[PDB]
């Protein structure tokens, strides 16, 4: 079976099983990876440029406004490649995902398995004068593929889908790997308050800190498997433990939850029910009259104001500190202008391989995300007054501008929820005394360690003369292609109608033209965005 | 028993760059990449604006004087170190991050009898959790173009602790640190203890 | 306590006396008076994420 | 599995297990060897030049001072290659070794195993005019690798790490083998006393002695295994029996061991305790007054004076006869001058492959070794007097200059201890009626025979015409690469604090800059020296 | 044992035991306290300077 016998098999499908109360989703995915010879065989540690728009030192125009962009960092570059199925688009066909968000309220992940077979390694031999050279691709029956997977998570994570670097979303195209590399400590700290006018900026510390620097090769961390052609590999089943993520969006605010303020029903249509003057109810503060639905007591609050957009200048900073996920559509925001970015708003740049139509072209999305309302707290629109009494506040004692964090013990908020195709699936939980309460971009945060990372490198083939010179043309050019078959099982409880009138069922974005989501004459098509969070529901 | 050097910038996938051929040289940032971003930014794609599912450390007003019944008193901030900034022992000695100073008698390990000595833990090894509120900013809208003079603010002084943040306790301290502490009975207990 | 195992290749900086302090002050004197050192600690680096 | 199936596997790690009283260390190492076709297929015996700085005959300037350098010898050159893991740097990651010398008092070796798989043999075919020739590397599915291991130790040793010739210290780089060859008797004897003034030098005997010469091929000594590609090989577990080597350095001398001479404690600080005039105690000689701590009796002595540096002119000589391992730091010696070489002081030259940063460059170390004090006996500083009495000696009867061996039944001394990375691990014990009591450079000396040597040669592939002419271009050019996975288990008892105040824990050398021990932008880095012998302890 | 018999004992040490995966630390401490007669035998409640 080593040669002339195929070890692996192709399965790409997803199947549902309803037990009458809960759904079990088993989704298979298999891809054809094109792996290439590592640029250098040795680890490296180096420091980087700040970025395209970062100012050259001494540019005080725009003051410290333009310093946010770096994008400066320092890292160790391993000669390894990282195949991670952390995107949603891997596992779910667009129509097979549409059935998930349609029929299910919320979902968990259970298991993940991975298998690498069957390997094919070839070498490039160019014979000819040069003007008319002829390449010849002939395979090495004896050559190695190195497969390193760390179940103990000794390595830094760097498997997050961000900077997409993930397997393609289209089963029949080939995939390219991205190189595995991770951070080592450095100080980017930037002082933007320097000056007599406080406006000017400068950078006090830059560069790598070598005293405490940690350097972890792949060889020492994990056990490596050397695979020839007839070999196969498997990671074994990995069981997540995670909380379910809601598939439904909340339209309620603190105003939409409660007992509505008693009013007199209209006799004729159209008419508006008048507010009843004399009622009895709890109120905040000293108010007796008027009794209002704004000042009425409630035992929790929904959403919180946050400074946006916060630039944290840290070691390595600046960086953004996220706010709430709410939608700006209740305010004047629309796609096509004025396009308010206020609530935490993610924008996905993606390659042709990730579902762009044009080859070698870039496209973006910018999730609004328009369906989350009632969680909307936009700090520029807010106020506080000193004393709460029957009379309205004086000109003094009433403030409106800040810009303050209202997160507190009472607040209740929602995560962004899953996102398709480009959303990450799971994420690692940092080890600190206080773990985050909820994750920003990742639906699932592994309680125990995250699924081990799977690294792959094409073992070097050397020419007869190893050292010469000078290290010039030491290895013979080589490339490999292998197949990767994963499966992950999910568990979801199915939705039942809670209302009388008909829902608006999920689907393609509203304005988009349906021809762009189905292949073209050339064969290029784009996958749709599903939020989702595609169904409304009641919070309270 | 271990200190964290990572910040929100040190955690993640590093922004793709082109490795240097010669030493010393710096790897140039790749112009065209694909990745998530906050806000409406498409170009430039930056490592500052890139999305991450949690944040490390939080800005805090310092030093807060709470005037209470019996007050004033200090309300603590994060335990981070000021060594990434210009702070050094022997000047300028920034007290910013929560910084404890231990006065101790001869009986407690001072050499001279009947004499007093101090320490002032920095604590220099906690970095990447460092958020010093005077150095921070917020801008109204996040877009490809940099913010206008208006809509970009820097001075506050606001609490960024939220559901996303991840932070560290001061950890044990020797010799003078306390070992255990009592938990107050309230409906909301503290999530993490400052000195104990 | 659960014991530490090396997670890196190169050698750590192991804990000890504060950097600038003179080691003679932590061991008894002619009169017999000495001072104990500060250990943080939190004396080892590690990875958060 | 012969073709297309990978026999071997990659494991490079070391793991500790504490039983609460003793540590068990299991360290794996695996390397990628690049083996090349032997220069000639036939054994050879030949004589060599004296050396670079050895005088041409009749050069009487410098007298016999410059004759020490040869470096002259005669040997039999086998067409075989020797892969020996005799260095410490093979088995221990720098941080994984730092934990050994930190937590353990002393250590033994228990077992060693070795495995050679998986073999890849290729041939070089150059087709083209010559101006624009194109090499083509295509593998021989049928070709042999010869693996010879002698468990019975019929061959001379020549496996000592000296002249480093050992596997690299960095797991991801490739290794080159060194050719196996050993000595045959010869007479180099040099007379440096010839002349009327006794100063001039000449060589009386030179050349090989063919009468009693012993010639041992590899084929007759050991059984050889012929391995094709799909084959694997293993040496079986080899159990050492050896004594533990101390991980701690001794600061005590004969003066530091004992009961201190009674004195009157100082009342104020700072002050010095005055020596008590009238005490009762044993003394050497006839001394009653003054009673001194120098003349007081003690039942053993520490360290011994030795002539340094002794040049033994032997058959094949000159050579150095070692002294004690002590440090010169108590005297005026410092790195950066004046740099006294007196105590036995080893200097390690090492290649890029052995942990030098620059490729094809040489670097040195010169272990001081600064931490061994109290064993320091430097013969130029010493004296003897005829009679030991109350009065000090006369001008006559008091001598200071020699230069004499004080090793005797009373003396107690220390071996150099292990050394990292470049130190040897084990060594062979010569068979003589009097074996050495302690080894100079090697921590472990096998009581029984040493671990068998592992020789490997690439079996010859012949062109159709064997004899032609004339022996011109008889074999087709060929090279091979295979993987070598050893493991050796150690046993060590863990250290517990014997003092109140905090230790100085082991680590990087003091003055060195930490950035040089972690990879560079190009990826080149250097391993640190650990002594060690990194902890102080009490001798007595 | 009430008089002329010593009830207590002096142990000041700490000892570690490694199970190969986890450490068990047992630390003893013993001190000699000098206790003095209370200034007043009665409880008190009072207010202080700033």
Numbering used by the authors:
A (entry chain F), D (entry chain R): 33 to 572
B (entry chain Q): 279 to 474
C (entry chain Q): 524 to 572
E (entry chain Q): 33 to 82
Task: Provide the publication's sentences verbatim.
The BuVs, along with CuV and TuV belong to the genus Protoparvovirus, which prior the BuV discovery contained only animal (non-human) infecting viruses, and are classified as novel Primate protoparvovirus 1 species. The VP2 monomer extracted from the refined 60-mer capsids of the BuVs contained the core β-strands (βA–βI) and α-helix A (αA) observed in other parvoviruses and large loop insertions between these secondary structure elements. However, unlike the animal protoparvoviruses, the bufavirus capsid contain three separated protrusions surrounding the 3-fold axes, as has been reported for members of the Dependoparvovirus genus, human parvovirus B19, and the HBoVs.
Movie frame micrographs collected for these VLPs, at two different cryo-EM resources (West/Midwest Consortium for High-Resolution Cryo Electron Microscopy and SECM4) yielded capsid structures to 2.84, 3.79, and 3.25 Å resolution from 29,596, 7564, and 5234 particle images, respectively, for BuV1, BuV2, and BuV3. In VR-I, two additional residues are inserted in BuV3 relative to BuV1 and BuV2 and VR-III contains conformational difference among all three BuV resulting in Cα position differences of up to 5.0 Å. The melting temperature (Tms) of the BuV capsids determined by DSF were 64.9 ± 0.2 °C for BuV1, 77.3 ± 0.3 °C for BuV2, and 73.4 ± 0.2 °C for BuV3. The Tm values obtained for BuV2 and BuV3 were within the range reported for other members of the protoparvovirus genus, for example, MVM. BuV1 contains five cysteine residues while BuV2 and BuV3 contain seven each. BuV3 does contain two cysteine residues, C59 and C520 within the same VP2 monomer, at a distance of 3.45 Å, positioned to interact within a hydrophobic pocket, but they are not engaged in a disulfide bond. This proximity may be contributing to the stable BuV3 phenotype compared to BuV1.
